[PDB]
Amino acid sequence: GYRVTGYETQ
């Protein structure tokens, strides 16, 4: 298994 996140704001 694995986990991933991403987040961005201008």
DSSP string, 1-10: ----------
Give the Cα separation of 7 and 2 in Å (integer). Answer: 17
Structural tokens at position 3: 């986990």
Give the Cα separation of 2 and 4 in Å (integer). Answer: 7
